[PDB]
Amino acid sequence: GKNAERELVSILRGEGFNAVRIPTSNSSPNPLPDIFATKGNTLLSIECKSTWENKVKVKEHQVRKLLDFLSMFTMKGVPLIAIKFKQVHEWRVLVPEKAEDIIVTIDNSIPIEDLFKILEKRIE
Amino acid sequence: GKNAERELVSILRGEGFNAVRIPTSNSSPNPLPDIFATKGNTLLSIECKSTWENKVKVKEHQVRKLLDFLSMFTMKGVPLIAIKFKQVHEWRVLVPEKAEDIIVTIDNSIPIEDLFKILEKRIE
């Protein structure tokens, strides 16, 4: 839990983002991501999970925290389910459409460096 | 600790701010306030304390978390030491100049409703 988050934070920082872990984000009511990160006018709101399976279920209640967090800010806000698929030694992300249950697989996620590219391409 | 924060959050919400408590903001390194709040393009970064004394010392390390938090956002950012002076049954705030040790008293703080007025007067 703690270790994967610290790893993601370090990867975010090497991409040029300020990134910070939020500690007791528990099943509690508070709209807080596991990690938030900024670079310029972009804010990331991240649920962070690592697994040795090939899929991960994330619950509506947790996804909703990501979105409620973003809605409080006037920055460009991108919510992410960031998953370390340890089988392939890969960080992948899925951008949630809305607050619902989501099964993240290799097929519906992208490599995190692709996300970084999408953000750069928008800078234009 | 928990109860004063929940009270401040409720007061913030009645002023029209989205406000959220951050749980394990401990003497730890993470730049996280006790509470953050937004309304429009303004973000508050708050260290929250209640006391039965007439002064409160806040440490540089804690003040710095407020500021490092704000510096990650492109919103208007106002750091606050929000103190419930229980002797007079009053929430007062001090806006820190910079990261240093600060002794908050009645004399160098203002009523929190005055802070709210200053923000409104700027909207113009």
Minimal Cβ distance to A30: which of B20, B30, B40: B20
Closest to B85 measured CA to CA, from B3, B4, B2: B4
> Touching check for B87 and chain A: CB below 8 Å?
no
| Residue-wise DSSP of A8-19 | HHHHHHHTT-EE
User: Which residues 6+ apart lie within 8 Å of B92 measured at CB?
Assistant: B82, B83, B84, B85, B104, B106, B109, B110, B111, B112
Phi/psi for B91 (5° steps) reads: -85, 120
Burial of B25 (0-12, 13-18, 19+ CB in 10 A): buried
Whether residues A38 and B73 touch (CB distance < 8 A) is answered with yes
Interface of B with A in 27-66 (CB under 8 A): 28, 30-32, 38, 40-41, 43
| Residue B14: strand, helix, or coil | helix
Which of A21, A23, A40 is opposite residue B23, by nearest beta carbon? A23
DSSP state at residue A73: -
Q: Do B26 and A23 touch (CB under 8 A)?
A: yes
**Number of Cβ atoms within 10 Å of the Cβ of A98:** 10
Query: Is B22 strand, coil or helix?
Result: coil
**A65 and A25 in contact (C-beta within 8 Å)?**
yes
Helix (H) or strand (E) holding B58: strand B55-58
> Using CB atoms within 10 A of its CB, is residue B2 exposed (0-12), middle (13-18) or buried (19+)?
exposed
Taking the CA of residue A74 and the nearest CA in chain B, the distance in Å comes to 6
**Residues 6 or more apart whose Cβ sits within 8 Å of residue B124:** none
B26 touches chain A (CB under 8 A): yes
Query: Tokens representing A8?
Result: 């993601």
| Length, in residues, of chain A | 124
Sheet holding B18-21, edge to edge: B18-21, B35-39, B42-51, B76-85, B90-94, B110-111
Q: For residues A27, A32, A38 and A43, what is the CA-based torsion angle, rounded to 10 degrees? A: 100
d(Cα A70, Cα B101) in Å, to the nearest integer?
Answer: 32
- Given resolution (angstroms): 2.0
Burial class, A35, CB count within 10 angstroms (exposed 0-12 / middle 13-18 / buried 19+): buried
Q: d(Cα B82, Cα B39) in Å, to the nearest integer?
A: 17
- Return the CATH class of domain A1-124: alpha beta
Does A81 contact chain B (CB < 8 Å)? no
| Nearest-by-CA chain B residue for A69 | B20
SS (H, E, C) A42-59: EEEEEEEEEECCCEEEEC
Token digits of residue A63: 């996804």
Q: Among partner residues A24, A40, A75, which is closest to B23 by beta-carbon distance?
A: A24
Task: Give residue numbers after which chain B breaks (C–N above 2.5 Å).
Answer: none
Other C-beta atoms closer than 10 Å to the C-beta of A55 total 14
How close A71 comes to chain B (CA, Å)? 9
CB–CB contact B75 A72 (8 Å):
no
Q: Phi first, then psi: what are they for A24, rounded to 5°?
A: -100, 20
Q: Nearest-CA distance from B102 to chain A in Å?
A: 25
Tell how strand B42-51 and strand B76-85 pair up. parallel
The answer to whether A48 and A5 have CB atoms below 8 angstroms apart is yes
Cβ contact A72–B20 (<8 Å): yes
* A21 neighbourhood in chain B, CB within 8 Å: 30
Round to whole Å and give the CA distance between B9 and B36: 9
**C-alpha closest to that of A102 among A70, A55, A65:** A55
Asked if the Cβ–Cβ distance from B30 to A43 is below 8 Å, we say no
